[PDB]
Amino acid sequence: CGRLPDFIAKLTNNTHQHVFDDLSGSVSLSWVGDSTGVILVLTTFQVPLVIVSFGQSKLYRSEDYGKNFKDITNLINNTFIRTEFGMAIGPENSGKVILTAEVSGGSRGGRVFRSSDFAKNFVQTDLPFHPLTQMMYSPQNSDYLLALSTENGLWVSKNFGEKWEEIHKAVCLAKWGPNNIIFFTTHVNGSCKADLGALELWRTSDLGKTFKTIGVKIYSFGLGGRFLFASVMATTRRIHVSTDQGDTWSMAQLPSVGQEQFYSILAANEDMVFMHVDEPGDTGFGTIFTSDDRGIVYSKSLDRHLYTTTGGETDFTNVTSLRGVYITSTLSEDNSIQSMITFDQGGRWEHLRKPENSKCDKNKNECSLHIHASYSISQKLNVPMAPLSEPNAVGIVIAHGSVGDAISVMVPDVYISDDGGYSWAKMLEGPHYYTILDSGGIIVAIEHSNRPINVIKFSTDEGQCWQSYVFTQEPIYFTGLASEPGARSMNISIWGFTERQWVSYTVDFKDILERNCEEDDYTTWLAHSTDPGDYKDGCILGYKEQFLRLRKSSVCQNGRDYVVAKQPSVCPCSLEDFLCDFGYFRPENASECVEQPELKGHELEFCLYGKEEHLTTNGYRKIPGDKCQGGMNPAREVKDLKKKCTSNFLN
């Protein structure tokens, strides 16, 4: 590293401290918009919903990037905010902020505080109901809001929460869809919890004027990517998939008929669907399945995928910093925990490579790096944050990791990856709260412990070289860490307390990164490919692209994109460009899809929209979203036998 710039003098002039006198309850801090100036500090209280309580939430606004906060509590006089609700921030550049509150004395409805100018000016609005869930912006229109009342009434607002109109009265759960479509379940008898398995799923495209019952005997439903899900009670629970907003459905097809199992949707996008199916009976870990572009035909993707028995949380992770990369945890035959990583969107999984920082070697199960995610959070392990990545910060992945030793499981370490998870390196000791900013230019981290802290660990070279910085002589008990939005942001905000009086610390890094990076500061790198050969070194699902990376200890402000230029180029297909077909799987550290043993010599059939099909394949099919052309082109054929099996438990 050899970092010798006097960072103390550059940061001391930029360390803006603001003391908040006597804040009771949980304190929330949020930057509002990029390059706006607006920082909100809200006071929240943990209070049961239906209980009417007295209280006054304190609100402070800064319009000068954390330098001075103005007390604007009179805006929300005689109201208070609950912790589970908090702020309702709209999409990027929408400038919309909703503050759902409750009247201090009590009322016949809630009260919101609405703003469209990046929280610079709020307006008061009395709700004709008490909200059960938080306001939900529509992905198509930020002016449209749906909410659920304490009386299970569905309320819609067309004008950014000013006027609300109830559209149904027995709603259990409502979610936005594409093009302002609202999907919601309703019941008739008693309660929602008593009629689980006997619910009706309705659709509305007119914001409450037209309805269409698209499903009966519904247990639950969800949206993911271009797919609509619904668990239907056949008693037996089966997952049905719809891509046409619920007009036509199709039952999910697995290479087996495992009755009364437990199904779960890990993730889904505009290409495919990740499904987690629990192992039969109560054995623990399940098996991941990958679907086609229609989300109907699944195949075994990864065996022994761990999950939490009560909750169902897994270590499945979306590497947002590199396309097609996903990381999760599995259990080996030695009953040790491993971290599996795929670079081809679930096509082939391989073990996570142990860090180059070799400080280690059933002794082989030891030294295996386990990246903690939602499964580790549910197991009550000391993991303060899930894996964090950003699309702007291409290749940067920061997360907690442990070793096979139970001591390292009790105290995980912070690992940094600059190639999307292919290689790792221990950079920080102990658990930390971290964030990414400046499109990956600055990475901050704060110690997570019981003692008060006062040290900022940051890095300007994408987490390659770190250096500490004391930002206060009065240590504070850490509460939260926030960053300014935008691609060229350079500020953070830390707020904590002593013993109890609160205080915030806003740090500017503009003086640290005084020089703009040049071509002698950027080293390039290519994404990892499971197949050998220089022809596809750097190809990501059939698309080869080049990426930039700051050199070690590069103290400079990067104002460029990490994807270089356009340069469209197609790669030839290979093993990494094809999923295993219906009834096929890849053995451990293998590159060929063999056929499942119990399916050899049988009729490969699966009911596709109520019509049976016969599959004749070599064991491969194209990955949904893969744009490879040429090279490997295996032969597969779907033969329509016109024989009809019932695969739709909906009207």
Added chain:
Amino acid sequence: CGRLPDFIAKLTNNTHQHVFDDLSGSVSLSWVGDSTGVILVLTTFQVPLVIVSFGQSKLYRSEDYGKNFKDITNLINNTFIRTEFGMAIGPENSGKVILTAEVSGGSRGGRVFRSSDFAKNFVQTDLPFHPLTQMMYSPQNSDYLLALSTENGLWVSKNFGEKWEEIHKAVCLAKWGPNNIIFFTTHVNGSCKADLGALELWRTSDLGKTFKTIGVKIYSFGLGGRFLFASVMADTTRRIHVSTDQGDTWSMAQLPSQEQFYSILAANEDMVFMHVDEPGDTGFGTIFTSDDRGIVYSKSLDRHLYTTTGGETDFTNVTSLRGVYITSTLSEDNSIQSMITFDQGGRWEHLRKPENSKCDKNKNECSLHIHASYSISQKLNVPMAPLSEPNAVGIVIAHGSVGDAISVMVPDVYISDDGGYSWAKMLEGPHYYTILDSGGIIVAIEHSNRPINVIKFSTDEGQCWQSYVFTQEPIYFTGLASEPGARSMNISIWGFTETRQWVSYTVDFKDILERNCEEDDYTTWLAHSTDPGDYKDGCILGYKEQFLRLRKSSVCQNGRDYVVAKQPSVCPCSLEDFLCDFGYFRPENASECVEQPELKGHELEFCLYGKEEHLTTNGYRKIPGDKCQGGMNPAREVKDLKKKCTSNFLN
């Protein structure tokens, strides 16, 4: 509170410190037996069950009342303990301690470390299975142990964990019964979570040689008092069946009011408290009280709050005064109240606000809400449930908040010296507390983020408190333990600093209480009665007794019981000595049971063991356990009719 005796000198010589070097993971501490001087300190690790990990738990033992601890880790080396298991301490005089462990490298089964001499000498025994749950002693015999394996197998041991024998293989939940009877549920298809509502309840009296399927279509089952409960699925509808003869004959619970949700709050040798959720799951239900057979219930309390996910309530049984119970309800203003009964659920009143209320601005404001399991489930800052002891007659210590949302975030510690009738705020902020010396000493420790070093104790039943600095190096509090015994004077605190180094502090109060109390140290008091007149002031279910209470700032050792040892005089019956009969209820602040509106002009019929009965009552029935004679005695009569209904879905 004119307390000026030098507490520093008496406690400093009795404050014994011991430091533990290089401790990783959670730290448990337990006194082993009364007047034995044995203290165990165990290191536990939070590790998933089916995952085989490497680790070593450290074990320390003190045999001189916490003055010196000896490292005895070599006894349990190459093994580790999970935090969810910990120690398995038997009854007080049993001297039995079980240490369920897991082999550091992995094995075919767990390993236990058994001791019968108050943890003075342990023996090693390899289990033929991996335990899913902790060892369960039997109430009839401490030598009998049942455990549940990771493969849902039920194992029993007749000789204190020395030899184990499996008796069933598809068990979902097992519980001990009276006289070593074992009740357990089993399935057949798939898993236990999928067979909910279709389970078989079996009985065993010979530790696994003979069986008897006493129930079919079972959803759940539990034990309480002299009653066995079983949630039976009729169609689909879930109904509760009560059995007093260990499951040989059942009888469905009869209530004055479809597909609702039932819950068992508490159960005695006399009656049963039953919670029934209102149709809609709006967060509140109704408490029902039964007869001596636990069949005929009646509306005892309306709008009883419960957690929607979990079903926990604020129902608290004041063990320090017979027939007193405290729970939380929801008012018509949707504010939370604490209701208290002094006649075992016959009549409920509002908890009286403390004297000289600091909040004295509104009517619903200033109301005291005692926190219990419901507040714990609401994720409120309540470290302990209400604490009381039958030895410490009348003493109740609990956390309480006000109508303000700030007070809910930081509840205060309230003390009652009359079983819950009157209260007073004694300590600011949450605390961990304990009772000692049969009520002579009440210790309390501040709960916060900062390190602590103060012991708050009271010798006059919590009327006057005094702080005590037990260390110059403050520690982060972890746990507070007490030596068993009616005349115990020792406590054990253990915490850490900042790596992280642990330390324990054992404090003896023998020198504080050097004088035995005398006649001018005790002030007499009578229990509270809802009915007016001096003829019933002090009656508890027909028995009037006089209780003793230490004067304010009474620094002395209690020599006699707080109850004047006589034969108590019998009280004449009145309205407070009668429950509301089947189909009746008491309105708010009303002492007369009026008939339920929807039942006026109908045949009050309830199926008693498959046979109809006709109720002709004035609206009252004697409380099970009330021994009053004379006074009021309204007429009621149960005539066996000719109709024979079906009130049993079991065979």
